[PDB]
Amino acid sequence: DKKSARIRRATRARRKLQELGATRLVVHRTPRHIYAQVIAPNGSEVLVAASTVEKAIAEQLKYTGNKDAAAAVGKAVAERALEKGIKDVSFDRSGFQYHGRVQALADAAREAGLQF
Amino acid sequence: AKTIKITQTRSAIGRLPKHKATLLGLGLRRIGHTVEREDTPAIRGMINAVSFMVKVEE
Amino acid sequence: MLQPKRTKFRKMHKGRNRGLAQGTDVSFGSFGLKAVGRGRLTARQIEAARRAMTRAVKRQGKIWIRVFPDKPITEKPLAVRMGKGKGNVEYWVALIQPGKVLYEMDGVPEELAREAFKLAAAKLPIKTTFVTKTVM
Amino acid sequence: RNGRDSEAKRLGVKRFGGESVLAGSIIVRQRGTKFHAGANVGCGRDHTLFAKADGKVKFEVKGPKNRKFISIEAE
Amino acid sequence: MFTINAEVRKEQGKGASRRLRAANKFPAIIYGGKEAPLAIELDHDKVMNMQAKAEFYSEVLTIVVDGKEIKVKAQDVQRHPYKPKLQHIDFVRA
RNA sequence: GCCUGGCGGCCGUAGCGCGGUGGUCCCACCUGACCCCAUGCCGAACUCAGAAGUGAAACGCCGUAGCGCCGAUGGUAGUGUGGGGUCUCCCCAUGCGAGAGUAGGGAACUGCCAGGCA
RNA sequence: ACUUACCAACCCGAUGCAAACUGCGAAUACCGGAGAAUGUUAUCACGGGAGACACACGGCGGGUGCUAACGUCCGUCGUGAAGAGGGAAACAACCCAGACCGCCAGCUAAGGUCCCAAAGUCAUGGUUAAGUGGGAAACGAUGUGGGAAGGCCCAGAC
RNA sequence: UCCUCCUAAAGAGUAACGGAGGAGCACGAAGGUUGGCUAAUCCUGGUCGGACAUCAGGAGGUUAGUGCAAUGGCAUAAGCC
RNA sequence: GCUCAACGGAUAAAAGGUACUCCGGGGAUAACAGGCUGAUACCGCCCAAGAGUUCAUAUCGACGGCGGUGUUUGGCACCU
């Protein structure tokens, strides 16, 4: 199973970040969307979330689900997270390779001020 | 303030160290030593522990 | 003589024989020879008793030996001192408690089961009794 | 042919539940991870679990495999 | 068709049960349905000669306790290991 | 309110199996690959650019107990203390009291956020 | 390729066994925290002086032995050692009990009350006739007291 | 002399010429980290090819593996690249 | 830089005989005898397959079972 293989790739860094107790920026890449949400150190409650399924992001994009869309989402999460006093997170790539548009999303979150 | 009265009725010679400690907890020194104590479940547990060698009266 | 085909360790500790038994109902057959005494049973006593039964109720019937030895008993030879290791495995016993159905029998009348179980209970060291297959 | 055994290694639980510890204190000297490390507990190289912060020892059972964690409550 | 006169056990545990079997009785319980389980003591000899029949384990029994009647069925009997006597009987309501 | 996605609590009353259903959005399969990147061969996987087509598989949801799972009451085993016997084993008073089995329960419950529909 | 009273893997149902098996799991013990009463600080640390490092039996849990030994080796508790007194005839270690001294005073524990020998030849209801009591098993037997049933039976049973 | 299990009485420790086994090393990668992956065995199909060498699919679930004993661990892998 | 492996390592460096023997000790520890035990030994009994022309029990009694004795071979190391 592809989804289950991804989750067991995620698990080590997930449990390590729950062990350190850092607020994590969980990404989620789908073939036509990217999702990004900032989660509290208790793991239960979210703080900030942006994604391409929001029409505030989706209307200003050509196609949700490429590197431009993901850069838009990273910029959005960094902006909202700085508006809510969150400065220093840890990036949870959530089982994907840090390569494509998760790299675009995280680089875009680092340009717009979010410290990781 | 019920003050149950406790009497030692057997010797404490061949006894376990826990039971001699309990008789020292109750304050009993020799056979036929009537000693009055408060009636609380801690004291009652001590009387229960050595009930074969204390006659209690209330 | 009965003996396990292949053990895991050759010498077992003595240990004790306490409490009651597990095999208690006549399970497979219809009549049963149930232990009352404690004791232990060598493989020679089980074989002796089984030959007494098989002779007694001739080659009709069907007999189940519900106990199996599987416990090795070691002895030291004669004129050997104490110490210098554990002895050697001489025979194999089954440990019996009160309640074990030692044997079962089916396919005979009850009066032959009485007869074979009398004939074979005189080859065993434990006090024994006769039971039937009770329904629940 | 026999007659040998190793020296006894003195494993086990050194600090039990609710027992106040200093930082650095060994909680369970053990052999695999029979007990796993929880919050404020570290696992040493020989799977010795030691108190990484001060507090109270908390034995718990977590996760999908029913593992036996050992946390430390800050106290 | 069997009527088994019973009493209610005011005492239980291994002390009280072993005291109850030396007095030629044995404990039992009636559970099942929606009601609470009912601890019951039974005379021994009546139930032993009664269960020598086969119909004891198949037919609906009637247990008379405190002048009532509970139509039960004999669920499961603990027997003594090496003696012809009974330890305990579970009766499911019917 | 209903549905879907993410991250958790919880860790089988939560999992399996059999049957039914879902795609506007979401998700999955999918379409293509010269590029970013990749295969000890292969765009199968990973990755990228997309959205024609289908919900077949997958996944979710709804049923169904064939099984797994939970599980009393009672009794039994054991046992701390004191006493007793016919004493390699048991009994008595007393305190604790299972495992297995039975009746039964049972196809989860829930928090935060986000999107679609009414 | 054709037949077969023989054996039998795996799977399923039922039955047991395990110190070096565990999908379960006590009592107890141990560690930690709080609280009351009691205890001549009984606790810990430091310093002066040791002695001792042959243990024995008895209960409980075991290894070894033959579930042999007044055997041997452990764990734990008691006593002896180093503890007299009363009891078990006599009997370190078993049961009761811990001796500062005195008394021709009382009450008791274990154990006992016919005589040696202190105290019931006590009271009520049973049992055994074997001197059982006051050694010893498998097994044998119309010994004898009790209990629950059952077959036949004054259309006459044994 | 040292390691592992049992004895060992559910904390630790615990004896016997008690029951069973091992060590007196290996490794510059078999260490560090990052990224990824998941076994045994059996069934079916398939050139030489066979009970068993490779391929493909299914069942299965870690019965596998862990440089070397045994025990405890290990999927977030401590296993494999 | 040590199989100092007798692994808390006496030396850098070490095998035997003694019935020609000797001294200090020990019943802490053997040989005899006693004691405890009874595996073994001896004696007895229980079941009865069978042998005995038939017929288990005149006489024997397989496979097994339960005791007694303290007569063997032992075990222990309590007395010396």
Side-chain angles (χ1 to χ4, degrees), chain D residues 7 23 59 72:
Chain D
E7 173 218 37
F59 287 89
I72 279 171

Side-chain angles (χ1 to χ4, degrees), chain C residues 21-39:
Chain C
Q22 295 303 317
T24 305
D25 196 72
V26 174
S27 180
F28 299 95
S30 181
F31 303 108
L33 188 61
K34 174 183 281 189
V36 168
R38 193 162 295 279

